[PDB]
Amino acid sequence: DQLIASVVPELLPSAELYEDPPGLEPLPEEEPLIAKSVAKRRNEFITVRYCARQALSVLGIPEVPILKGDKGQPLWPDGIVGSMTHTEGFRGAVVGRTGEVRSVGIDAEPHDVLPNGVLKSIALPVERDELDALPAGTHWDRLLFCAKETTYKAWFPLTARWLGFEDAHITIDPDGTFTSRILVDGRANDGTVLSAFDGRWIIDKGLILTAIVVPKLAA
Ligand SMILES: [Mg+2]
Ligand SMILES: [Mg+2]
């Protein structure tokens, strides 16, 4: 009953953990990336890459470092796309072949009200009214935050550009889907235009997991 696996296609292997297993190490090439980091950050960095290497192995890729670009993005092997996320009680990664999908993003958050002031900073005025109308029993504010994070993670590998909270309008459906409408220039690096993303969401184990897969276009 893994969360990521329940919201991405079977052809995108994923792996996740809810605690840091004892004894894990970064690969040698990864050590400089967390040398200056606090211990909590070291732990999540190491464990999420353990998960990513597990998923990569399913695609036939043996142990390899996963470094980071200047904008924080993970640097995947040739022919691979993927995404990672970590929060209190969750580390997760998903990967896929560029021959199968264009991009993927995921995000995890605890299923609770957003911290004070955060919803105001992330939500368009219309989004706030929309969330107020969704069915009781779900922290839709936190789900919106997650979906916004996921939208940027799926977007950046295809554009190499920023996407702020105000640059996409996210509509959440109670049925476990959402849509992200892009409000900025959507020209992508493959010549196409990105105007909207389709996403999926699940709440389980006290956590929200959101995911966007950007499909390949028809030939
Ligand atoms: Mg994190
Ligand atoms: Mg996040």
Automatic annotation (TrEMBL):
The 4'-phosphopantetheinyl transferase domain is annotated at 103-186
Q: Name one GO molecular function term.
A: holo-[acyl-carrier-protein] synthase activity
Where Mn(2+) 4 binds, per the record, is at 107, 109
Sites where the protein binds Mg(2+) 2: 107-109, 149
Positions of CoA binding: 41, 49, 85-86, 107, 149, 153, 163
Xref: PANTHER family: ENTEROBACTIN SYNTHASE COMPONENT D (PTHR38096)
What is the protein's name according to its record? Possible 4'-phosphopantetheinyl transferase
Which species is this record about?
Mycobacteroides abscessus (strain ATCC 19977 / DSM 44196 / CCUG 20993 / CIP 104536 / JCM 13569 / NCTC 13031 / TMC 1543 / L948)
Please name the taxonomic classification of the source. Answer: Bacteria, Bacillati, Actinomycetota, Actinomycetes, Mycobacteriales
